Amino acid sequence: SHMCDAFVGTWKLVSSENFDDYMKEVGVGFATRKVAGMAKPNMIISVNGDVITIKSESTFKNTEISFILGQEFDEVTADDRKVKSTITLDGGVLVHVQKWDGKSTTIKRKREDDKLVVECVMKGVTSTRVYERA
Numbered sequence: 001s002h003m004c005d006a007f008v009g010t011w012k013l014v015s016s017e018n019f020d021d022y023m024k025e026v027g028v029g030f031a032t033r034k035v036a037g038m039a040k041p042n043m044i045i046s047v048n049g050d051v052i053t054i055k056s057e058s059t060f061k062n063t064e065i066s067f068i069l070g071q072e073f074d075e076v077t078a079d080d081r082k083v084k085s086t087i088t089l090d091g092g093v094l095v096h097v098q099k100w101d102g103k104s105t106t107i108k109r110k111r112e113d114d115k116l117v118v119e120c121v122m123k124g125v126t127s128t129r130v131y132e133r134a
């Protein structure tokens with residue numbers, strides 16, 4: 001057993017708050033916000049050795065990242081930002097920092113009860129997205 005066992009699995013979005021405002025703050029344009037905000041993604045998390053894979057699949061976009069904790073990687077986000085990302089474990093929370101164009105956003109993923117809670121922060125704007133096991 002290991003590092004991220006309680007994250008691994010298939011998860012489905014069941015609530016969202018403030019995501020349109022988070023997307024605005026990150027710079028997402030109107031049409032992408034409207035379509036992306038309608039999506040109900042499934043989040044699939046797996047681990048193989050030291051490599052963690054997080055997939056997001058929805059009607060809007062399918063994305064996938066694979067990474068080693070603490071080791072920077074390049075990521076193209078669902079809104080087509082070219083970012084440099086680092087994901088660490090901090091006290092049982094996966095902390096994902098994305099840097100681009102002198103900007104930064106942080107996405108935290110945590111297990112709370114039977115849920116996986118995602119908090120996305122850009123400057124003073126936070127969005128909370130709650131996932132349940134599929």
Ligand SMILES: O=C(O)CCCc1nc(-c2ccc(Cl)cc2)no1
Nearest residue numbers: 023028032036078079107118120129
């Ligand atoms: O998994 C979640 O639900 C949220 C965490 C992953 C994440 N997705 C986005 C995002 C940004 C822009 C656009 Cl268009 C669509 C998606 N930002 O953070």
